[PDB]
Design a binder for this molecule. Sequence first.
Ligand SMILES: Cc1cc2nc3c(=O)[nH]c(=O)nc-3n(C[C@H](O)[C@H](O)[C@H](O)COP(=O)(O)O)c2cc1C
Ligand SMILES: Cc1cc2nc3c(=O)[nH]c(=O)nc-3n(C[C@H](O)[C@H](O)[C@H](O)COP(=O)(O)O)c2cc1C
Lengths: 207, 207
Amino acid sequence: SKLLVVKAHPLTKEESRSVRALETFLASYRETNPSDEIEILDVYAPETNMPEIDEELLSAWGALRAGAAFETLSENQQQKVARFNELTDQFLSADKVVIANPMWNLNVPTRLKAWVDTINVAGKTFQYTAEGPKPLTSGKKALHIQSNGGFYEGKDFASQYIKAILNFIGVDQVDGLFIEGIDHFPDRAEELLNTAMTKATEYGKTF
Amino acid sequence: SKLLVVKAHPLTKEESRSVRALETFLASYRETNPSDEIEILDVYAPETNMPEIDEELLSAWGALRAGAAFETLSENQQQKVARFNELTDQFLSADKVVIANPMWNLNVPTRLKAWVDTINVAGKTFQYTAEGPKPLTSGKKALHIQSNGGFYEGKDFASQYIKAILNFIGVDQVDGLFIEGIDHFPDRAEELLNTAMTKATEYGKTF
Ligand SMILES: Cc1cc2nc3c(=O)[nH]c(=O)nc-3n(C[C@H](O)[C@H](O)[C@H](O)COP(=O)(O)O)c2cc1C
Ligand SMILES: Cc1cc2nc3c(=O)[nH]c(=O)nc-3n(C[C@H](O)[C@H](O)[C@H](O)COP(=O)(O)O)c2cc1C
């Protein structure tokens, strides 16, 4: 019932194949699951106030490990700490997650790594046990929508990373939708885009 | 001759294992090579102003590709484009590169990814061809100094990624110094840090 949308592309559907496939997935998803809550997290939007692990955050977390009151932190630390935590709890609230990004230099875009930093939290999404770390979520589903220049066989670093992280925190069902290969064969744009658009709609009906 | 230092950690040597190893290495390197130019890029410092690939940047490149004059872009787009290029030229100008970062969630810090984005540039560090993409750089050397919570047999995503990018652009010599396992074995802190320190000084002497 709650679908979190992580939009990890700075542009809109008109400029982006990742975002276009996201939008056709979501139209199909909404029509198929009219009662589901759909929450959008646009990690590039200025309004989102995306936290970044930085000096103030690392030190806020030390200051709290030590035992300062959340009120001994600067206004700007308390804000970052609380914003970071909002993002973790948002993930925890979601039954399903859809992530949309382009492949940029064989890794996730910077703001997508920043979002991943919020979902890997000891005592929140995973825990330390005598047998090693163990997930703290179960029953979540994820869909990774990503556009690549070339054809990777789901074997690119970015999609493997997203899957490993999601698997670590207990998201065992990870689907992919990859819009690939148009940069290599621009003359197959209509055909590849059509294939991707129909796969997006179909995920809308089954995810 | 010219050593570029990429420090990708928000904290100082007093609070960071990878920064402490970096500083040991640098002290030993300057002693060994007093004539070499040592330029520091601290990706987290206030002064740095490193762009990330975002809407303003992408739309700037888009406008330039459409034939618009640099001077027609917004003042901040012009700043962003120029800074991004300055970063790429800095890498091209270095004979040797040392990168120092902690491992955060099996991957590099967000701003280190932002720095990799400035070094993997069609027409400056690699090129597309009929045979495949090919490097545009020759003769460089790299040292990757990274601290990890557990023991990765150089097999972690972050250091594999860093090695992948460097090799792709023509840097065939990529050395590693990994300060690992202290989070698992705090009682071994003294020994593990001393070992790392000796390797960092030895790299200063031989790199
Ligand atoms: C900064 C930059 C880096 C890129 N790096 C890669 C790369 O690692 N591998 C690849 O196959 N394509 C790469 N591409 C090409 C895009 O992945 C391809 O254009 C993609 O279809 C864009 O998705 P989008 O339309 O949602 O932006 C890169 C493109 C840009 C702008
Ligand atoms: C945000 C965060 C994420 C981390 N993620 C990992 C992880 O993916 N794997 C791991 O082994 N250690 C992880 N650690 C532990 C650090 O890699 C480890 O403490 C390392 O020695 C820190 O290096 P530094 O002293 O230079 O900061 C993480 C620590 C933090 C602060």
